[PDB]
C-alpha cells in the first residue's frame, strides 16, 4: 500500500494537507492534494493511522433502545466482547437530516 513518494515530486505539507506532483500512467504529470486530517489521529502524542472502520472488527450491530449502537467487537486479543455507544452523543437532527457534529 501507498508508496506515492516513488513517482511524485515537489511534495509539501501545509496544515493537514499533502500536495504533490505525480506521474500519470499515460505520460505526463498531475498535481493533486489530499487532506490527512481524518485518516491520521493523535494518540497520546504520536501520530497514528486512523483506526479501521468498526464494521471490520465488530458484528451483530443493533440499535439498543432509542439511541444506542450495540455490537460485539473484537479485542486486541482477538476475543469478542459486548459494547455499546450512545449515538445521541454526536448524531444530531439538523432540520430533518441526520448529521454528525
Instruction: Give the residues lining the site for Ca ion (CB under 5 A).
Output: 5, 11, 66, 70, 82, 84
Nearest to 69 by CA among 54, 84, 81: 84
Contact yes or no for 32/20 (Cβ under 8 A): yes
Does residue number 10 form part of the binding site for its own copies (CB under 8 A)?
no
DSSP state of 76: T
23 lies in the site for its own copies, by CB under 8 A = yes
Build a one-symbol-per-residue string for 82-101: x at contacts with its own copies by CB under 8 A, - elsewhere. -xxx-xxxxxxx-xxxxxxx
Smallest distance from its own copies to CB 60, Å: 11
Is position 32 an interface residue for its own copies (rule: CB under 8 A)?
yes
**Is there binding between residue 63 and its own copies (CB under 8 A)?**
yes
* Minimum CB–partner distance for residue 76 and Ca ion (Å): 18
Q: Residues with Cβ < 8 Å from 68, sequence gap 6 or more?
A: 84, 85, 86, 87
Structural contact between residues 29 and 22, judged by C-beta atoms closer than 8 angstroms: yes
Q: Does 33 bind its own copies (CB under 8 A)?
A: yes
Amino acid at each position: 500500500l501507498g508508496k506515492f513518494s516513488q513517482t511524485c515530486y515537489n511534495s509539501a505539507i501545509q496544515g493537514s494537507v499533502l500536495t504533490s506532483t505525480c506521474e500519470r500512467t499515460n505520460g505526463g504529470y498531475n498535481t493533486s492534494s489530499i487532506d490527512l486530517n481524518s485518516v491520521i489521529e493523535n494518540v497520546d502524542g504520536s501520530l497514528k493511522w486512523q483506526s479501521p472502520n468498526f464494521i471490520e472488527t465488530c458484528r451483530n450491530t443493533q440499535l439498543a433502545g432509542s439511541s444506542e449502537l450495540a455490537a460485539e467487537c473484537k479485542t486486541r486479543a482477538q476475543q469478542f466482547v459486548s459494547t455499546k455507544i450512545n449515538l445521541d452523543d454526536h448524531i444530531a437532527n439538523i432540520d430533518g437530516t441526520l448529521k454528525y457534529e
